[PDB]
Amino acid sequence: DTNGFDILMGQFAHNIENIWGFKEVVIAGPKDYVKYTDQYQTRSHINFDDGTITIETIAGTEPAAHLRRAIIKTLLMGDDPSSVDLYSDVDDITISKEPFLYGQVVDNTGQPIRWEGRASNFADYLLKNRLKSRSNGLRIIYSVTINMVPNHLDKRAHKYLGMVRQASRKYGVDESLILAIMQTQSSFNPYAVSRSDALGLMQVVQHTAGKDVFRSQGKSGTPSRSFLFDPASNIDTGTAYLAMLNNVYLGGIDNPTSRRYAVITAYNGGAGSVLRVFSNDKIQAANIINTMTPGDVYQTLTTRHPSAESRRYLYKVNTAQKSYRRR
Numbered sequence: 001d002t003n004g005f006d007i008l009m010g011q012f013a014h015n016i017e018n019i020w021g022f023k024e025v026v027i028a029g030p031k032d033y034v035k036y037t038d039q040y041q042t043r044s045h046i047n048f049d050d051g052t053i054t055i056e057t058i059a060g061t062e063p064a065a066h067l068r069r070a071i072i073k074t075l076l077m078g079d080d081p082s083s084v085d086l087y088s089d090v091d092d093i094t095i096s097k098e099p100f101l102y103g104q105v106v107d108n109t110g111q112p113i114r115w116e117g118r119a120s121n122f123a124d125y126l127l128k129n130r131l132k133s134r135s136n137g138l139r140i141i142y143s144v145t146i147n148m149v150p151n152h153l154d155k156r157a158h159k160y161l162g163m164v165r166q167a168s169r170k171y172g173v174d175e176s177l178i179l180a181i182m183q184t185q186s187s188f189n190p191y192a193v194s195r196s197d198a199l200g201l202m203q204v205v206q207h208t209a210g211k212d213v214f215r216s217q218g219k220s221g222t223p224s225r226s227f228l229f230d231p232a233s234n235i236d237t238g239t240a241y242l243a244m245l246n247n248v249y250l251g252g253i254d255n256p257t258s259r260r261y262a263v264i265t266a267y268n269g270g271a272g273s274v275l276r277v278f279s280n281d282k283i284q285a286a287n288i289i290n291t292m293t294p295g296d297v298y299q300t301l302t303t304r305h306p307s308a309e310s311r312r313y314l315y316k317v318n319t320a321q322k323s324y325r326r327r
């Protein structure tokens with residue numbers, strides 16, 4: 001095991017904790033892109049659920065200078081998530097004719113940003129007119145907040161719809177379920193990384209779901225971090241696990257709506273945990289489910305299942321699915 005990945009997460013967080021204070025240890029998550037540059041002095045934070053871009057620095061020397069730098073690079077960054085290291089300070093951000101953010105944010109001119117010229121003017125504007133300052137209690141932080149367009153979610157999702165269509169046809173899993181999961185888990189952030197090393201758009205863990213999927217396809221080993229950070233691959237894997245959950249691990253459930261509630265919960269909690277909500281023996285755990293209505297099942301799962309994380313998850317995913325379901 002290269003748990004030596006845990007180690008440099010530990011090293012990463014401690015390097016930040018040293019420089020920013022334990023009060024300011026902001027680190028990438030499933031719905032939050034956070035990239036440190038300039039030796040942990042400058043950080044760029046995209047918050048994908050709230051539609052905000054926050055670019056901070058704590059450097060006491062020419063803060064505007066390299067706020068400007070992060071601002072231009074972040075706006076123009078070409079999404080290759082598999083080549084970006086959010087647990088590192090090395091600048092592995094690349095400028096692209098087609099920035100990942102293109103269309104999700106407009107300058108104060110109202111124009112989408114794709115050229116270094118326009119990006120530059122916009123940085124200069126923000127620096128002159130929206131420069132903010134804060135202090136942790138012990139040292140001064142300079143920042144710029146950039147609001148993303150109101151329909152930024154839809155813009156982002158548009159990138160992956162084709163993949164979702166394909167995966168859905170392939171594995172017989174509803175588009176709306178894939179989209180509802182993906183939205184809930186990452187808000188369609190391809191750089192998404194969790195505290196349990198779930199990876200990518202559909203937040204797939206390598207040694208559990210990833211391993212199962214490979215095995216179920218005559219394939220050997222476990223998907224790498226590069227693989228699960230490639231949109232197409234990740235969505236195909238996640239969707240495959242959705243199908244594996246639905247046919248194999250939870251096929252005992254007869255009612256498709258009840259199976260779905262079970263499948264959704266299990267995607268986050270494991271089918272094991274889900275079955276052991278009805279009882280320790282998979283057999284009549286399944287038929288206790290076969291006695292209840294789906295409203296029951298959704299009830300019993302949203303209230304009486306161990307992981308609080310899961311109980312909210314099922315509520316969340318079903319709530320999103322209802323909006324992606326109608327066409």
Ligand SMILES: CO[C@@H]1O[C@H](CO)[C@@H](O[C@@H]2O[C@H](CO)[C@@H](O[C@@H]3O[C@H](CO)[C@@H](O[C@@H]4O[C@H](CO)[C@@H](O)[C@H](O)[C@H]4NC(C)=O)[C@H](O[C@H](C)C(=O)O)[C@H]3NC(C)=O)[C@H](O)[C@H]2NC(C)=O)[C@H](O[C@H](C)C(=O)O)[C@H]1NC(C)=O
Nearest residue numbers: 194196198203204205208209211267268269270271272273
């Ligand atoms: C962003 O939030 C994170 O979301 C992730 C999902 O989007 C979620 O990851 C999921 O976590 C659960 C466990 O927490 C995990 O479920 C396990 O899955 C494996 C693989 O199918 C099961 O192991 C198999 O068990 C069967 C029999 O049941 C065996 O026959 C088979 O051989 C086993 N295969 C392997 C490779 O071991 C496992 O079943 C256990 C062993 C059991 O029956 O008791 C499941 N666990 C449980 C408890 O049932 C799920 O697959 C995993 N990944 C995905 C893509 O869904 C994150 O959860 C993390 C890991 C967490 O625990 O916090 C979510 N949270 C975070 C913080 O990242």
